[PDB]
Amino acid sequence: TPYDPLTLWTTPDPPPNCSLIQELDAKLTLCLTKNGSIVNGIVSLVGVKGNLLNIQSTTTTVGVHLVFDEQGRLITSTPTALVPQAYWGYRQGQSVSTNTVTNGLGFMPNVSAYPRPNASEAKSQMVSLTYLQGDTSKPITMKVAFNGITSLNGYSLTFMWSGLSNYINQPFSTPSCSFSYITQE
Amino acid sequence: GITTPEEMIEKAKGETAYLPCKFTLSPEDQGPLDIEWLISPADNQKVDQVIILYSGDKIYDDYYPDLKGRVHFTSNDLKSGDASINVTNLQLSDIGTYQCKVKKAPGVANKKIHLVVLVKPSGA
Numbered sequence: 001t002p003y004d005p006l007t008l009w010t011t012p013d014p015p016p017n018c019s020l021i022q023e024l025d026a027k028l029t030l031c032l033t034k035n036g037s038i039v040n041g042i043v044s045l046v047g048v049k050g051n052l053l054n055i056q057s058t059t060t061t062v063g064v065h066l067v068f069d070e071q072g073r074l075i076t077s078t079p080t081a082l083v084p085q086a087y088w089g090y091r092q093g094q095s096v097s098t099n100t101v102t103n104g105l106g107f108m109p110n111v112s113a114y115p116r117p118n119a120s121e122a123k124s125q126m127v128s129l130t131y132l133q134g135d136t137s138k139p140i141t142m143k144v145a146f147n148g149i150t151s152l153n154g155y156s157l158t159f160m161w162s163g164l165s166n167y168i169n170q171p172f173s174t175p176s177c178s179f180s181y182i183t184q185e
Numbered sequence: 186g187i188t189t190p191e192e193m194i195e196k197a198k199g200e201t202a203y204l205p206c207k208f209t210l211s212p213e214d215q216g217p218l219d220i221e222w223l224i225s226p227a228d229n230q231k232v233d234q235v236i237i238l239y240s241g242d243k244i245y246d247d248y249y250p251d252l253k254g255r256v257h258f259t260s261n262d263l264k265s266g267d268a269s270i271n272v273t274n275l276q277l278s279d280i281g282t283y284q285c286k287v288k289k290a291p292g293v294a295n296k297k298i299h300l301v302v303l304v305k306p307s308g309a
Contacts, residue, residue: 002291011293015221015238015286016245024238024245048235049248085217085241087290095291098215 003090003097006034008107010088011095016048017086018064025049028064028081029176031091034106037183043144043159046173057168063160070153072104072184079149105185108155109146113182119148126179132167134175140164144179155184186294187287193299197306200275203259204298206268206285216290217241220268222256224249226281233284237270239263251278275302 009031010017016024029044045064047053052062064081068074076084089096101107114124124146132138145158161174188207196202204222220239225232235248237256247253255274260267268287272279280302286295 011288013286015219015240015288016235016248024240083241085219087216087219087288089290092291093293095288095293096216098290 003092003099005090005103006106007091008032008089008101009091009096010082010086011091013094014087017083018081019083020062020064020081021052022050024083025052026081030066032107034183037110038180039107039183041179041181042176043179044174044176045159045161047171053171055164055168055170055172060165061160061162062164062172063158065149066157067149067151068104068108068155071101072106072108072155073101075154103185106183108184109157110182110184111147111155114146116147116150116152119145124148126181128177128179130161130175130177132161132164133171133173138167140167140174142174142177142179144181146181186292187285187296189296191297191299193301195301195303195308196275197303198275198277200306202272202275202279202300204270204272204283204285204300206270206287206296208266208268208287208294210266210289211292214289214292216288216292218264219286219288220263221286221288222268222270223284223286224252224281225284226251226278228278228280236283239268272300275300277302277304 016027018026018028020026027046032039032041065079067080087096118124126144130142132140140163143160147156148158150156189205222236223233224236238245259269259271283298
């Protein structure tokens with residue numbers, strides 16, 4: 001096969017692929033690799049236009065969502081951060097394959113472990129301490145929530161970077177952040 | 186891929202720079218066409234700053250403030266295989282490495298251009 005079936009990503013160097021506050025104002029790099037019952041993931045978000053380049057005084061949190069259908073296929077509409085033309089699928093070289101994902105449930109957060117109505121349960125969250133712009137003097141928290149913004153028979157991933165309250169007038173960018181979760185299949 | 190290798194364009198203040206980026210598409214390249222031009226200025230220390238895009242069959246600009254309203258795609262038909270751009274009224278602040286990224290899943294290509302701007306029009 002020309003592609004790797006254990007990896008789903010946004011390609012390593014995606015162009016602005018999110019319209020968070022305004023049209024294409026952010027670059028979200030996300031790579032998910034399946035390793036048995038656990039998916040090793042790495043996420044990164046950076047502002048490139050609008051308010052995401054100069055954190056508003058009243059903002060305290062910046063987050064993105066990724067909703068998947070019952071087959072583990074991304075749905076490119078609200079609230080999914082990635083715009084519809086955004087690249088997402090199996091890895092093939094430094095790009096993605098155009099083949100539809102047929103083993104998506106292997107990358108989805110286990111609904112038994114993280115039930116859809118359990119988004120507020122600690123177990124459905126992986127919270128860590130990280131640093132804005134990688135600057136160790138600017139600590140923030142990244143909270144990954146599983147299946148919290150899911151429809152029904154669906155799945156989701158939520159990334160919440162909080163504590164931005166006192167980093168006003170600065171560009172928003174996160175370092176490469178790691179996370180993991182138990183797979184559906 | 187792109188038809189031109191990494192080059193260096195030396196121009197003078199006031200002039201306009203034509204940055205080439207012509208590409209060819211394979212039958213395999215079926216993903217949506219994606220063009221992104223980035224810049225690594227010489228003055229400040231920022232790198233890979235977005236300049237202009239061609240995403241979802243639409244042009245998006247005004248990402249790099251210091252370059253506002255002076256960057257436009259030269260071709261009137263991007264899809265045809267030309268992602269070249271212009272930088273009107275060149276200034277000394279415009280010096281840096283400009284990168285052209287042409288993607289069409291699974292295809293991907295990129296070119297780097299070192300733009301140099303001289304105060305007085307002379308390269309002898």
